[PDB]
Amino acid sequence: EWYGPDRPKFLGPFSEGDTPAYLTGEFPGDYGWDTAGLSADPETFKRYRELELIHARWAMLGALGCITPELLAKNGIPFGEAVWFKAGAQIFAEGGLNYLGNENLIHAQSIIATLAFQVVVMGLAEAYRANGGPLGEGLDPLHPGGAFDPLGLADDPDTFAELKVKEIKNGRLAMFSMFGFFVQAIVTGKGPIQNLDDHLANPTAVNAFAYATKFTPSA
């Protein structure tokens, strides 16, 4: 289970009649769904695992940071308009951009300062992720360990090979939920907790089909 040629797959009982021969079960997260045949080259399939895992990690950081300014908004925390798809414009408010509500916090007005600081920080940090450097060099490009596993959890290689599957499954629906949050903000124009409050107010009447005739081309 979870590895070998007897792993669960992406269609269940129907899935065994078309599964790619180059997908075997030797990598975590193998459910046998490469019907478009994009990763048949084993060199590109080495790269697409790296692209998938990094995208998942920004998604798990991303999806948690989209709702924590809104759950705190309903628990009586003073924000200046904490909804994720328009909280970037808070820096053009007259009080700068205070962090929680307090002026003795960060208080950033010039975005040119915080932008150019980021690209130098993230420039070397993303450069060190590929080549290595001060937090180790000769390490696995996906799971280096050591400096990024302080708590010793990446031991017991029958457990470490299963926390990967928890790493990517928790990662995949976070990628699927940020693709949620994007579209539910484009169409509706409100925060996802406000959407989740409004679906629970009336689930039969208030759902996505109320917004189905929004993009009809009037010409």
Partner 1 sequence: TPDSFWYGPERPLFLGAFTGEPPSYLTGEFPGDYGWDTAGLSADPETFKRYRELELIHARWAMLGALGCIFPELLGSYGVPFGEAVWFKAGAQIFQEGGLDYLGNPNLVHAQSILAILGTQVLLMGAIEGYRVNGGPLGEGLDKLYPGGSFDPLGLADDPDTFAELKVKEIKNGRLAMFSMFGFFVQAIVTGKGPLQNLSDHLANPGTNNAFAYATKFTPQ
Specify the residue, 82 or 175, whose C-beta has the smaller distance to ligand CHL.
175
Minimal distance, residue 136 CB to partner 1, in Å: 35
Nearest in space to 141 (alpha carbons), one of 126, 153, 156, 152: 126
Minimal distance, residue 194 CB to partner 1, in Å: 22
Minimal distance, residue 149 CB to partner 1, in Å: 25
Give burial (CB, 10 Å; 0-12/13-18/19+) of 197: middle
Buried-exposed string 140-175: b where 16+ CB fall within 10 A, e elsewhere: eeeebeeeeeeeeebeeeeeeeeebbebbeebbebb
Question: Rounded to whole angstroms, how far apart are CA atoms 118 and 140?
Answer: 26
Binding site residue list for chlorophyll a: 31-33, 39, 48, 52, 55, 90, 100, 110, 145, 166-167, 170, 172, 184, 188, 195, 199, 207-208
- Residue 89 falls in which region: left (phi positive, over 0), alpha (psi -120 to 50) or beta: alpha
Please say whether the beta carbons of 174 and 56 come within 8 A. yes
Specify the residue, 158 or 215, whose C-beta has the smaller distance to ligand CHL.
215
Q: Where on the chain is the footprint of ligand CHL (CB under 6 A)?
A: 8, 10-13, 31, 209, 212-213, 215-217
Of residues 175-214, which lie at the interface with partner 1 (CB under 8 A)? 204, 209, 212-213
Please say whether the beta carbons of 71 and 193 come within 8 A. yes
Among 6, 14, 104, 115, binds partner 1 (CB under 8 A): 14
Specify the residue, 202 or 213, whose C-beta has the smaller distance to ligand CHL.
213
Please provide the DSSP assignment of 146-197 as one string. GGG-TTS-S-STTTHHHHHHHHHHHHHHHHHHHHHHHHHHHHT-S-HHHHHH
Among 2, 3, 11, 29, binds partner 1 (CB under 8 A): 11
Out of partner 1, ligand CHL, none, what residue 104 binds, judged by CB under 5 to 8 A for its kind, is none
Of residues 30-89, which lie at the interface with partner 1 (CB under 8 A)? 35-38, 40-41
Minimal distance, residue 51 CB to ligand CHL, in Å: 16
Out of ligand CHL, partner 1, none, what residue 124 binds, judged by CB under 5 to 8 A for its kind, is none
Question: Rounded to whole angstroms, how far apart are CA atoms 3 and 25?
Answer: 5
Out of partner 1, ligand CHL, none, what residue 17 binds, judged by CB under 5 to 8 A for its kind, is partner 1
